[PDB]
């Protein structure tokens, strides 16, 4: 393995290091996402009421 791969623009890298978060960082993202999206979905539900 670990051959110098014959391509530029490497594929065996997610672009950022904060991608797929295994462990108890998944449980803290999923809480922190649901805080953000639930506070977004009821500022549309206010602005569609006006």
Contacts of 16 (CB under 8 A, 6+ apart): none
> Closer CB to its own copies, residue 3 or residue 12?
12
Cβ-contact 29, 21 below 8 angstroms: yes
Cβ-contact 20, 14 below 8 angstroms: yes
Q: How far is the CB of 39 from its own copies (least distance, A)?
A: 9
Q: Footprint of its own copies on residues 1-50 (CB under 8 A)?
A: 11-12, 14-23, 25, 42, 45-46, 48-50
Contacting residues toward its own copies, per CB under 8 A: 11-12, 14-23, 25, 42, 45-46, 48-50
């Amino acid at each position: 393995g670990f051959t110098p791969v014959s391509m530029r623009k490497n594929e065996t890298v997610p672009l950022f290091s904060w991608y797929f978060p295994q462990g108890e960082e998944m449980r803290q993202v999923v809480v922190l996402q649901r805080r953000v999206v639930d506070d977004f979905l009821n500022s549309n539900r206010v602005a569609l009421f006006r």
